[PDB]
């Protein structure tokens, strides 16, 4: 009878189920604090679910709530820890889809831990029955949380100082075929491509260690090819040695090996996951290593507009974690890339602060707290005939990677590299002189002009001139300019 | 061989007219220009010799071209590069560097190989010009 | 010149672009080998794209191809390494959606590396422009690849032997509120819940280490509560101590601490990523620790039928990696869960081999190569009034977790735990006696009968009787029985 | 206190009719039954004493009930449990274990606390019945 | 497979002739640390058999004189020399003296010829700790290759085979003791099975017979042994002793 | 000295007739052939320069001999080797490599010795031709 006598009988904490919007997780008058973490969700409620209740449900189940009232809330400063949905707008040109802004108290999150941030923001709410579809579109990571993270190990500025390369985009290429090559032939391709003009090559994302080539064989042969090309050109050269592996112990073993033999750079795959990524980003800073992130698996959740995580959020999480490069799209290549979305991704990675820019998908103002800048990488189905488009959409601080577009050259790997570099430098020179190079009657002419004195470029333009990848995008803007 | 440091070294040597347009482009962005010389072409020779101070207050490209051609008259045979510095927060670094002068003949480099542990090779890139003659007499 | 004289002029290896279906990645006559890795994709081609060409594109860009021909293929046993799309069927009741079967040579994949398997299978193809939507539905992991993986550190059988508990589902509960509790109050909740009858409690997925509670405070207090409840009951007791952290070094530190103080179990979050998961699964075997996996973030790619990764594939990858528990759905709780899909997930986790069972989403026959069985965990918005449904859908080898359904009890945490345990044991006893317990006129009566002599259960039935989560599922079958 | 090992110990003590139906259930699955006794209730006392061999070939639930009631007549005061073993590939383990007999009074346990390093406590669960009397004289 | 059954009274003689090791068990083993293909790539030698020589007398030479013989043999054209199987560390020559002097002889011959050269430094020792110490020392001074004796046994062999892959070292296996069980037709273990077990364990070389030299070797059996070691798969070939695909 | 890389360098320099027979042997095995040049004879100089692409789709030994003689006409003084590549599963590697051309005079190498820890010597093989002159001017 003592349990009967001491039952809680208040409106808010008597046992039972009440709506999340009545549990403290909805407050249209809430005043956002500079220290709050903010999230923008695209919410598609199930039919018959109130849109504000859905927003409050997301806010509650990603902060402190569960499905029924619990008295143990009263052992805490419960008001402080509840997240607040504070704004629910209809999505333009949709009928049952809403933009929901949610504010989270700074103290909810473990310092410097991407795994903890994501455990709250994306942990459970995407599986909630009451929501038919849910997409994390943007986040405002507050200055005070960012300062707990390292940011890029090296960053764009120090990277170019380590390479002694300033004034043009950087150049790279994935070795092909994706799988099957031996370590000795891998070093040959790397040697040829670097000697022919590329700044970098890279292991394919699925080149780790396999029966046809064990990883130490690849690393040693590639370092012979790298140093050969550096002595043949007088330039710093490198190749992204892939240290992706099953366990953290093996990743570290491959990273230490790459450092011991003098590699300027290593690469990792996103499928390794946030905890390994954060560990190796700290390692890369501690060991003077450039850290290239291939975004393997990103499109399983980032492709569709109705559900998942927009890649611009991934960009923030990975710049926080501290990778030095991340693949970020080409617009004109073989992988999905709406240009307004892509330009937004590149700004997220490269700017010192973000302004609201709805056509670019930038929904929050956000200072980057002097975390270093992350180098976007444009890769996949591109060729030097598109150089005017690449320079226009993607700017100066980017690595343009030409795998098939280098190794597919009929006159050999060196010629393919030379064609790509001549196209790049000719385009940048003309841009700087004032040419209207993005215009289809101007850009292609700049390249044809340079090709009159560069056989490799003429051949490359002849071969790939008509190659385009024109498909309708899935990840598209909601606002026009 | 051709030293392909610099951002336009896969193009022919730049004429004075082409250099001026690149300078004009850099100064339009508010970047500071400077001129530097070396006769050690090693890829890790970070610090080429300064030709005076960077031209922080200079507003006319012709004054940069004037100092470049004075450097050309005064410096020993070797390399000259022109750099553009962006002191803005978020950069505070060079944002353009290209070669404006190179020697008539560059012998280049060879790869010295020292037997390390296991199969590891300890590499050194060695310049033919530097190993043969002191600074000021290499080209 | 020599390069022009030696240009390759064959149909297949002269430079230029040819369709993936002409590059060796399509073979309707291919004979599957017992050592092949097989993948089933649900492919939605862009309008105008040939469905077989799309399947060949997925096969090529997830094995050895790029977008243009490369002569370096000829330095390899190239025919051996190409993946083969070998069957493309229309999806029932759909236009322009196809099921595509693709076979991959065993040697493509690094032994024991989930990161490498996924780098190939999901690395890039989900972002391919030519495909408007892509979903990985199932995989046949061959016996010879499975034997390179550990499988569950402990497994269902040894887990029940460590706990000395056989004959009923296991019982658990997430501590609530999600965030804000101190370490001392966390141990209080754990003590009360275990003493009241639960086998386990657990940290919430976002409880790691935070200003309101640092992790060592929680671990020490919980171990006082655990040992107190064990001495009060004569049972083995535990609580999933969450070791999720930013870096592998910190995860290991928390894991070692949990072992040092005698915890039977730790938990990790899926957001930590595959490499950390594999590392800690090996650690858990080496250190006699049960390893509970919370699937945080899974629904960002697993929710929608048109795109992403079906959770049954995640189940295979995580059973290979070696977690001992994984959250796998409730059917009747607050998170998405079509019953045929759920039943399929549970079979994937618990059976020694899989038979084709299209209504359950099992598209491949697959032996599990004696990798241990992984314990499904049913959690989220369930209560003891649903016990007959839980027993029917989810079977014997499962942890039923009642967070709000324990702590939300008006007569306190012990009462809530006791209500859940009485309901479970009464339901299992009646099932074993032969009752038609799943029937709505029978199951609820078994519970009402037990409630006549159990005040806590009567109160819980009174409070939550009318609570359901009836929404239309998104992840649904394509075949009926 | 009530020892709540076993899978039905939150229900009242099982009648012989209830036990027989559980045995019938186990045997229709093809599981082998056995009977075990202890008077050490410690949660880590894995190996209760065997009452003969497991009844592998037995097909009539009445024969399991016969052995259970013979164990009840012969064993000292304490606990008896009945187990069901599934020898098939993938299990090869117990799949059901419940208590069929318990003492009239169980004093239970206390928690011994040894000061470890730092704030760590070294725990031991101690049985009042075991610490007081040897096996066969505990209840 | 061989634990107790060879001693059973009821069988008067027993010989293990062949085994079918299934694909799914093989994939749990490393296989050769380096393998034939990568070995020739490390040596830059393709087109002919490789060439070697055991230093003689078997025992008694000093480390300085061992290095002289290695220098002369390599300089004269051999790709390799090797320690004798019973050269480990002894009063007349402790092992570090041999290792240092051989590396001087090896590098001298390499500079005299423009070729990669080596000598199988024997790291066979009483304990695993001492074997590792000798392997690490061989690596530190730049040897391309080490050798081990079969008498060290399967657990040390598997340990050092993993070590050789992790440390970019060729691993030569001398089959010391093999003929105590592999010689007679009625009883023991046929060497083709040892070939399978040692290729699974991951040695890079193994002695496998000459046919025409001083040690036992019927050509049909020898040719069978070489197929087991070198092919990507085996077909039933009863004249050569290959009983399983 | 004579560089004894390659598999026939203890035999006299091969005639064109002898080279054609080796080429015919390789091609009858289905192997692909290529031609490579270098003037760095260091034993660890793994990547000699490619003369075009390998001759994958060539059936006539005269065609290989044609490219070899074109390489001999165009390349600077130094070394040419002919290789045969086996792309078959289980090999996927070179299976024959022999020298077809060598300079009139090869000075060879010396052994550079650096004092390591203890008695250890850190060795470097140094080519006289390479240290004296850049690529293309060594012989
Ligand atoms: O495997 C590939 O296809 C690539 O190596 C490109 O090869 P090519 O250069 O031959 O196309 C890159 O990994 C993709 O660009 C990754 O895509 P993203 O950059 O969109 O993540
Ligand atoms: O945070 C949560 O909501 C829970 O603690 C449940 O709390 P309640 O028991 O109070 O509902 C679990 O993490 C979810 O069940 C996870 O979902 P799933 O099992 O589908 O991955
Ligand atoms: Mg790739
Ligand atoms: Mg939770
Ligand atoms: Mg004591
Ligand atoms: Mg001998």
How many whole angstroms from C333 Cα to the centroid of ligand 2?
A: 9
Contact E24 C143 (CB under 8 A): yes
Give the whole-angstrom CA distance, residue A328 versus residue A387: 17
Instruction: Check: CB of residue F99 under 8 Å from CB of residue F72.
Output: no
How many whole angstroms from D112 Cα to the centroid of ligand 5?
A: 8
Give the whole-angstrom CA distance, residue C299 versus residue C329: 12
Chain B residues lying within 8 Å of F123, measured CB to CB:
114-115
Three-state SS letters, chain C: CHHHHCCCCCCCCCCCCCCHHHCCCECCCCCCCCCCEEEEEEEEECCCCCHHHHHHHHHHHCCCCCCCCCHHHHHCCHHHHCCEEEEEEECCCCCCCEEEEEEECHHHCCCCCHHHHHHHHCCCHHHECCEEEEEEEEEECCHHHHCCCCCCCCHHHHHHHHHCCCCCCEEECECCCCCCCCHHHHHHHHHHHHHCCCCEEECCCCCCCECCECHHHHHHHHHHHHHHHHHHHCCCCEEEEECCCCCHHHHHHHHHHHHHCCCCEEEEEHHHCHHHHHHHHHHHHHCCCEEEEECCCCHHHHCCCCCEECHHHHHHHHHHHCCCEEECCCCCCCECCCHHHHHHHHHHHHCCEECCEHHHCECCCEECCCCCCCEEEEECCCCHHHHHHHHHHHCCCCEEECCHHHHCCCCCHHHHHHHHHHHHHHHHHHHHHCCCCCCCCCHHHHHHHHHCCCHHHHHHHHHHCCCCCCCCCCCCCCCCC
Sheet with F49-50: strands ordered across: F49-50, F32-38, F79-86, F93-101
Which residue has tokens 């700087």?
A432
Does C164 contact D at CB distance below 8 Å? yes
Candidates A84, A195, A237, A294; catalytic one:
A294
Instruction: Check: CB of residue E189 under 8 Å from CB of residue E223.
Output: no
Find all residues with CB under 8 Å of C265, minimum gap 6, and list them: C200, C238, C239, C240, C241, C289, C290, C291, C292
Sheet with C170-172: strands ordered across: C170-172, C399-401, C375-379, C325-327, C290-294, C265-269, C238-242, C200-202
Indicate the residue of A160, A166, A425 with minimum beta-carbon distance to B11: A425
Distances (CA, A) of C412 to A15, A315, A331, C189, C195: 10, 45, 58, 10, 12
Q: How far is F72 from chain E (nearest CA, A)?
A: 22
Using an 8 Å CB-CB cutoff, list residues of chain C that contact chain E: 35, 106, 111, 142-148, 369
Pocket of ligand 2 (CB under 6 A): A 61, 66-67, 124, 127; C 174, 176, 204-205, 294-295, 327, 329, 334-335, 379-381, 401-404
Closest Cα in chain F to C80: F89
Give the whole-angstrom CA distance, residue A13 versus residue A79: 13
In a 3-state reduction of DSSP, which class is residue F12? coil
In a 3-state reduction of DSSP, which class is residue E74? helix
* DSSP secondary structure letters along E76-106: TT-SEEE--TT-SSBTTB-HHHHHHHHHHHH
Which residue has tokens 């029978």?
C442
- H/E segment holding residue E25: helix E23-26
Give the whole-angstrom CA distance, residue B41 versus residue C249: 43
| Residue among A330, A296, A300, A302 at smallest CA distance from A468 | A330
Query: Which domains does chain C possess?
Result: 22-149 (3.30.70.150), 150-464 (3.20.20.110)
Kindly list the partner chains of chain E, i.e. chains with 3 or more CB atom pairs below 8 Å: A, B, C, F
| Pairing verdict, β C399-401 and C375-379 | parallel
E203 secondary structure, DSSP code: -
How many whole angstroms from E56 Cα to the centroid of ligand 6?
A: 9
Cis check: omega of the bond before C177, within 30 degrees of 0: yes
Indicate the residue of A176, A272, A309 with minimum beta-carbon distance to C275: A272
B 90-119 residues inside an 8 A Cβ radius of E: 115-119
Question: What values do phi and psi take at D94, rounded to 5?
Answer: -65, 140
Q: Which two tokens stand for residue C5?
A: 């004289």
Find all residues with CB under 8 Å of E107, minimum gap 6, and list them: B115, E117, E142, F111, F123, F125
Chain A residues lying within 8 Å of F93, measured CB to CB:
182, 184
Indicate the residue of A212, A224, A225 with minimum beta-carbon distance to F92: A212
How many whole angstroms from C205 Cα to the centroid of ligand 4?
A: 5
For B1-139, which CATH class?
Answer: alpha beta
Contact E37 A182 (CB under 8 A): yes
C392 catalytic? Reply is no
Contact F135 A225 (CB under 8 A): no
- Indicate which atom in ligand 1 lies nearest the CA of residue A298: 21
Contact A167 B46 (CB under 8 A): no
Nearest CA to ligand 2 atom 5: C174
Question: Which residue from A193, A271, A380 has its CB within 8 A of the most atoms of ligand 1, so it is best to mutate?
Answer: A380
Q: Which two tokens stand for residue C204?
A: 């919430």
Which one of the ligands is nearest to C201 CA?
2
Q: How far is A453 from chain C (nearest CA, A)?
A: 16
- H/E segment holding residue E131: helix E128-140
B 25-44 residues inside an 8 A Cβ radius of A: 25, 41-44
E152 secondary structure, DSSP code: G
Three-state SS letters, A366-429: EECCCCCCCEEEEECCCCHHHHHHHHHHHCCCCEEECCHHHHCCCCCHHHHHHHHHHHHHHHHH
Burial of B130 (0-12, 13-18, 19+ CB in 10 A): middle
Three-state SS letters, B24-70: HHHHHCCCEEEEEEECCCCCCCCCCEEEEEEECCCCCHHHHHHHHHH
Domain locations along chain F:
1-139
Which residues, chain by chain, have CB under 5 Å from ion ligand 4? C 174, 204-205
Does B21 contact A at CB distance below 8 Å? yes
Does E115 contact F at CB distance below 8 Å? yes
In a 3-state reduction of DSSP, which class is residue E181? helix
Contact B107 F131 (CB under 8 A): no
Give the whole-angstrom CA distance, residue A443 versus residue A430: 9
Pocket of ligand 1 (CB under 6 A): A 174, 176, 204-205, 294-295, 327, 329, 334-335, 379-381, 401-404; C 61, 66-67, 124, 127
Contact F133 B107 (CB under 8 A): yes
Q: How many CB pairs under 8 A join B and F?
A: 32
Closest Cα in chain F to E38: F93
E187 catalytic? Reply is no
Contact F46 A180 (CB under 8 A): no
Instruction: Check: CB of residue C120 under 8 Å from CB of residue A206.
Output: yes
Burial of E75 (0-12, 13-18, 19+ CB in 10 A): middle
- Indicate which atom in ligand 2 lies nearest the CA of residue A61: 3
Cis check: omega of the bond before E57, within 30 degrees of 0: yes
CA geometry: angle at C458 spanning C455 and C459, to 5°? 85
Give the whole-angstrom CA distance, residue E139 versus residue E107: 14
E 91-110 residues inside an 8 A Cβ radius of F: 100, 103-104, 107-108, 110
Question: Which residue from C193, C303, C380, C383 has its CB within 8 A of the most atoms of ligand 2, so it is best to mutate?
Answer: C380
Chain F residues lying within 8 Å of C76, measured CB to CB:
87, 92
Contact E24 C106 (CB under 8 A): no
E204 secondary structure, DSSP code: S
Contact E47 F96 (CB under 8 A): yes
Give the whole-angstrom CA distance, residue E127 versus residue E156: 9
Kindly list the partner chains of chain B, i.e. chains with 3 or more CB atom pairs below 8 Å: A, E, F
Count of residues in chain A: 481
Three-state SS letters, chain A: CHHHHCCCCCCCCCCCCCCHHHCCCECCCCCCCCCCEEEEEEEEECCCCCHHHHHHHHHHHCCCCCCCCCHHHHHCCHHHHCCEEEEEEECCCCCCCEEEEEEECHHHCCCCCHHHHHHHHCCCHHHECCEEEEEEEEEECCHHHHCCCCCCCCHHHHHHHHHCCCCCCEEECECCCCCCCCHHHHHHHHHHHHHCCCCEEECCCCCCCECCECHHHHHHHHHHHHHHHHHHHCCCCEEEEECCCCCHHHHHHHHHHHHHCCCCEEEEEHHHCHHHHHHHHHHHHHCCCEEEEECCCCHHHHCCCCCEECHHHHHHHHHHHCCCEEECCCCCCCECCCHHHHHHHHHHHHCCEECCEHHHCECCCEECCCCCCCEEEEECCCCHHHHHHHHHHHCCCCEEECCHHHHCCCCCHHHHHHHHHHHHHHHHHHHHHCCCCCCCCCHHHHHHHHHCCCHHHHHHHHHHCCCCCCCCCCCCCCCCC
| Residue among D28, D32, D29 at smallest CA distance from D67 | D32
Give the whole-angstrom CA distance, residue F51 versus residue F66: 12
Chain F residues lying within 8 Å of A192, measured CB to CB:
50
Candidates E82, E174, E205, E223; catalytic one:
E174
| Residue among C275, C169, E208, F101 at smallest CA distance from A253 | C275
Tell me, yes or no, whether chains B and F touch by having 3 or more C-beta pairs under 8 A: yes
| Residue among C108, C51, C58, C110 at smallest CA distance from C84 | C58
How many whole angstroms from C299 Cα to the centroid of ligand 2?
A: 13
């Amino acid at each position: 009878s003592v349990s009967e006598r001491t039952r809680i009988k208040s409106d808010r904490y008597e046992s039972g189920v009440i709506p999340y919007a009545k549990m403290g997780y909805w407050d249209a008058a809430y005043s956002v604090k500079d220290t709050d973490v903010l999230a923008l969700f695209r919410i598609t409620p199930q039919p018959g679910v109130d849109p504000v209740e859905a927003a409050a449900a997301v806010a509650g189940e990603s902060s402190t709530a569960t499905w029924t009232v619990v008295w143990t809330d009263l052992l805490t400063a419960c008001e402080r820890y509840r997240a607040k949905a504070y704004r629910v707008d209809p999505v333009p040109n949709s009928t049952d889809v809403y933009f929901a802004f949610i504010a989270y108290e700074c103290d909810l999150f473990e310092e410097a831990s991407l795994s903890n941030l994501t455990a709250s923001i994306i942990g459970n709410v995407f599986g909630f029955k009451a929501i038919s579809a849910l997409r994390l579109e943007d986040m405002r990571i507050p200055h005070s949380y960012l300062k707990t993270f390292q940011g890029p190990a090296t960053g764009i500025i120090v990277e170019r100082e380590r390479l002694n390369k300033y004034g043009t985009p950087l150049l790279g290429a994935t070795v092909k075929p994706k799988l099957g090559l031996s370590g000795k032939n891998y070093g040959r391709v790397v040697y040829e491509g670097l000697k022919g003009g590329l700044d970098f090559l890279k292991d394919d994302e699925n080149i780790n260690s396999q029966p046809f080539m064990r990883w130490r064989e690849r690393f040693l042969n590639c370092l012979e090819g790298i140093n050969r090309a550096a002595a043949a050109t007088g330039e710093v050269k490198g190749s992204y040695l892939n240290i992706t592996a099953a366990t953290m112990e093996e990743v570290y073993k491959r990273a230490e090996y790459a450092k011991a033999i003098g590699s300027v750079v290593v690469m990792i795959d996103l499928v390794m996951g946030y905890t390994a990524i954060q560990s190796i980003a700290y390692w890369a800073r501690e060991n003077d290593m450039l850290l290239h992130l291939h975004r393997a698996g990103n499109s399983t959740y980032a492709r569709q507009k109705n559900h998942g995580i927009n890649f611009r959020v991934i960009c923030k999480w990975m710049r926080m974690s501290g990778v030095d490069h991340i693949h970020a799209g080409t617009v004109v290549g073989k992988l999905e890339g709406d240009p307004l979305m892509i330009k937004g991704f590149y700004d997220v990675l490269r700017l010192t602060e973000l302004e609201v820019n709805l056509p670019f998908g930038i929904f929050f103002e956000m200072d980057w707290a002097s975390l270093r800048r992350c180098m976007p990488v444009a890769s996949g189905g591109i060729h030097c005939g598109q150089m005017h488009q690449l320079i226009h959409y993607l700017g100066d601080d980017v690595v343009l990677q030409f795998g098939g577009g280098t190794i597919g050259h009929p006159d050999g790997i060196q010629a393919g590299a030379t064609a790509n570099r001549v196209a790049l430098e000719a385009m940048v020179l003309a841009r700087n002189e004032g040419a209207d190079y993005f215009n289809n009657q101007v850009g292609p002419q700049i390249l044809r002009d340079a090709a009159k004195t560069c056989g490799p470029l003429q051949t490359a333009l002849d071969l790939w001139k008509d190659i385009s990848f024109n498909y309708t995008s899935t990840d598209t803007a909601d606002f026009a300019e | 061989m051709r030293l392909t440091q610099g951002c336009f070294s896969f193009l022919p040597d730049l004429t004075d007219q082409q250099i001026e347009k690149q300078v004009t482009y850099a100064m339009n962005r508010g970047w500071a220009m400077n001129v530097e010389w070396t006769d050690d072409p090693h890829p890790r020779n970070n610090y080429w010799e300064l030709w005076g101070l960077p031209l922080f207050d200079i507003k006319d490209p012709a004054t940069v071209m004037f100092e470049l051609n004075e450097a050309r008259k005064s410096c020993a045979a070797g390399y000259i590069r022109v750099n553009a510095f962006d002191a803005s927060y978020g950069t505070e670094s060079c944002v353009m560097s290209f070669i404006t002068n190179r020697p008539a003949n560059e012998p280049g480099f060879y790869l010295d190989r020292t037997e390390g542990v296991g199969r590891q090779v300890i590499y050194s890139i060695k310049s033919y010009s530097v190993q043969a003659n002191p600074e000021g007499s290499r080209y």
